[PDB]
């Protein structure tokens, strides 16, 4: 009961709970799963300053999210009693939607039930509607913990705005800061932690963390992300993080100046 | 009657004469001539005695809060606003009660301006606008009349907001309930109009909205969390 699986049928029921834990547990650790990347943006070159964003935009506008995992915590890194992590499973149809071939195979290997997603998945616009007024976004006091998450927030913004992402990177951050005033990207923070390098699973091992749940799924990933933050905060940052130094900078993008895309 | 008359007229005078130019003056007048401890009461005065009745000055009173730049006060004002909206929403309603409905409308408009217009959400735990409409629909015409104009007024403030401006999914969720209520055959003339006007104010084509089948759920209508009396 540590990680609750959410589908269409029990979304309303679980939001009712999330609506409440956000009050006492204002640290939100997050990760998404999606069908990879399929394209490079036309007319943009790697040498461009904003090329990483333009590559993000290009694929997020084109592809559908498959899982969001939210793990709730507090100042001291404690969890609420019962479930601490929700894994939202979104409607996805391998006949109709687009995807990179490899990603579907990897996600399949990890335990994604693509047929259940097609049949009983959550609609993303309905999910936005409910997140909008839940205190989890737009409200001050909340703090988002992530890992190599440019694409993760791109999807969340695409979903919350019900629109394609802004043409210009500048604009994407402006609207991003409204929905998510305070973000800490563990992978960004790691650029100040001598001898911490690699993907989430690698960093988890160096920090001697114990992963609960299935690897390469959002819920479990978000919970591991959550653990990697609070463990890394005491060990490298003395249980405090400088907002001016680290808040809001997503790994690989133009804020806080190296690929934005979380390759395997 | 809420404050001893001396301290009362003292703050009455701050808002008595308010304008674009004397704005910053009046905000300093307030900051000095009034004690910090009375602010919760200054907040009631502002919501109940000014905002509730004179909708023409809501932009000014909003500018005031903006100039004052006090968040703990801005929080008081938001709770006062909700509290009064609750009183009215749980009052003994009657065809005759025109005044009460007028106050609710103005308090709706005001709520829009201090939340939506400022890219802040109307929280589900403070007010569930979608459920309010459906509950109004099952209780009767009377409740609808109290609630549709009020919801319209608060949404009017979505156009001025990069977040809630259409096609925001919450904003469009509400609009789609209204679009379904507009389809109802026996919905009073004045509320079909009120809903039409709201669409034009948000630069929406009523016909392009996507009405659902919520009003027919019945089982869902029977289990709403009541926000009306
Ligand atoms: Cl999507
Ligand atoms: Mg990830
Ligand atoms: Mg360009
Ligand atoms: Mg993952």
Chain B: residue whose CA lies nearest to A140: B120
CB < 8 Å to B72, chain A: none
CB < 8 Å to A135, chain B: 121, 123-125
**Interface check B214 vs A, CB under 8 A:** no
Sheet holding A85-89, edge to edge: A3-6, A85-89, A67-73, A27-33, A143-146, A183-185
Q: How far is the CA of A199 from the centre of ligand 2 (A)?
A: 9
CB < 8 Å to A137, chain B: 121
CB < 8 Å to A128, chain B: 169-170
Tokens of B178: 């209204």
Tokens of A46: 């790697």
Tokens of B37: 């401890």
Instruction: Sort A237 into a burial class: Cβ within 10 Å, 0-12 / 13-18 / 19+.
Output: middle
Residue A3 has phi, psi (to 5 degrees) of -120, 115
Method: X-ray
CA of A51, nearest ligand number = 3
Collect all residues from A whose CB is shorter than 8 A from any CB in B: 19, 125-126, 128-129, 132-135, 137-139, 159-163, 175, 178-179
Domains of chain B by start residue, with CATH: 1-229 (1.25.40.180)
Q: How far is the CA of A257 from the centre of ligand 1 (A)?
A: 28
Which stretches within chain A are classed as H helix? 8-24, 51-60, 101-110, 114-120, 124-132, 150-161, 169-179, 186-189, 200-206, 218-237, 243-246
Instruction: Kindly determine whether residue A138 and residue B120, on different chains, have CB atoms separated by under 8 Å.
Output: yes
Tokens of B111: 């709520």
Q: Which residues contact A113 (CB under 8 A, 6 or more apart)?
A: none
Instruction: Please state, in angstroms and rounded to a whole number, the distance separating the CA atoms of residues A199 and A178.
Output: 28
Q: Which of B123, B162, B167 sits opposite A133 (nearest CB)?
A: B123
CATH topology for A1-264? Nucleotidyltransferase; domain 5 (3.30.420)
Angle subtended by helix axes B23-33 and B5-16, to nearest 10: 160
Shortest Cα distance, chain B CAs vs residue A124, angstroms: 10
The structure tokens 């309603």 sit at B93
Please report, for residues A53, A147, A154, A220, B143, the alpha-carbon distance to residue A31 in angstroms, rounded to integers and kept in the order given: 18, 7, 12, 9, 43
Instruction: Kindly determine whether residue B124 and residue A139, on different chains, have CB atoms separated by under 8 Å.
Output: no
For chain B, helix (H) and strand (E) counts, in that order, are 10, 0
Q: Which residues contact A79 (CB under 8 A, 6 or more apart)?
A: A25, A71, A72, A73
**Interface check B173 vs A, CB under 8 A:** yes
């Amino acid at each position: 009961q540590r990680i609750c699986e959410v589908w269409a049928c029990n979304l309303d029921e679980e939001m009712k709970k999330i609506r409440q834990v956000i009050r006492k547990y204002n640290y939100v650790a997050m990760d998404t799963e999606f069908p990879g990347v399929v394209a490079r943006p036309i007319g943009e070159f790697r040498s461009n300053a904003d090329y990483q964003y333009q590559l993000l935009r290009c694929n997020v506008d084109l592809l559908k999210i498959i899982q969001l995992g939210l793990t709730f915590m507090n100042e001291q890194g404690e969890y609420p009693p019962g479930t601490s992590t929700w894994q939202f499973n979104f409607k996805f149809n391998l006949t109709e939607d687009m995807y990179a071939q490899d990603s579907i195979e990897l996600l399949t290997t990890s335990g994604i039930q693509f047929k259940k997603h097609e049949e009983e998945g959550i609609e993303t616009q309905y999910f936005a509607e409910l997140l909008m007024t839940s205190g989890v976004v737009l409200c001050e006091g909340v703090k988002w913990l992530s890992f190599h998450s440019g694409y993760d927030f791109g999807y969340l913004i695409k979903i919350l705005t019900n629109s394609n992402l802004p043409e210009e990177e500048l604009d994407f951050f402006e609207i991003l800061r409204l929905f998510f005033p305070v973000i800490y990207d563990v992978k960004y923070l790691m650029k100040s932690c001598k001898n911490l390098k690699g993907g989430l699973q690698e960093v988890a091992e160096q920090l001697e963390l114990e992963r609960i749940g299935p690897q390469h799924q959002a819920g479990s990933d978000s919970l591991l992300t959550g653990m990697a933050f609070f463990k890394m905060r005491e060990m490298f940052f003395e249980d405090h993080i400088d907002d001016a130094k680290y808040c809001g900078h997503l790994y690989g993008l133009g804020s806080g100046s190296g690929n934005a895309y979380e390759e395997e | 009657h809420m404050l001893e008359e001396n301290i009362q007229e003292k703050i009455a005078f701050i808002f008595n004469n308010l304008s674009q130019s004397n704005m910053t003056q009046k905000v300093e007048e307030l900051k000095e001539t009034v004690k910090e401890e009375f602010m919760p009461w200054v907040s009631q005065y502002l919501v109940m005695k000014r905002v509730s009745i004179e909708p023409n000055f809501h932009s000014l009173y909003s500018n005031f809060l903006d100039t004052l730049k006090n968040p703990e006060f801005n929080k008081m004002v938001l709770n006062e606003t909700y509290r009064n909206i609750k009183v009215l929403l749980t009052s003994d309603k009657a065809a005759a009660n025109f005044s009460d409905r007028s106050l609710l409308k103005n308090l709706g408009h005001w709520l829009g301006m201090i939340t939506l217009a400022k890219n802040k959400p109307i929280l589900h735990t403070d007010l569930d606008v979608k459920s309010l409409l459906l509950e109004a629909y099952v209780k009767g015409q009377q409740e609808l009349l109290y609630v549709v104009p009020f919801v319209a007024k608060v949404l009017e403030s979505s156009i001025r907001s990069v977040v809630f401006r259409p096609p925001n999914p919450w904003t469009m969720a509400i609009m789609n309930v209204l679009a379904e209520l507009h389809q109802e055959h026996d919905l009073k003339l004045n509320l079909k109009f009120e809903i039409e006007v709201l669409c034009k104010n948000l630069a929406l084509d009523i016909n392009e909205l996507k009405p659902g089948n919520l009003l027919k759920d019945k089982d869902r209508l029977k289990n709403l969390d009541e926000q009306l009396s």
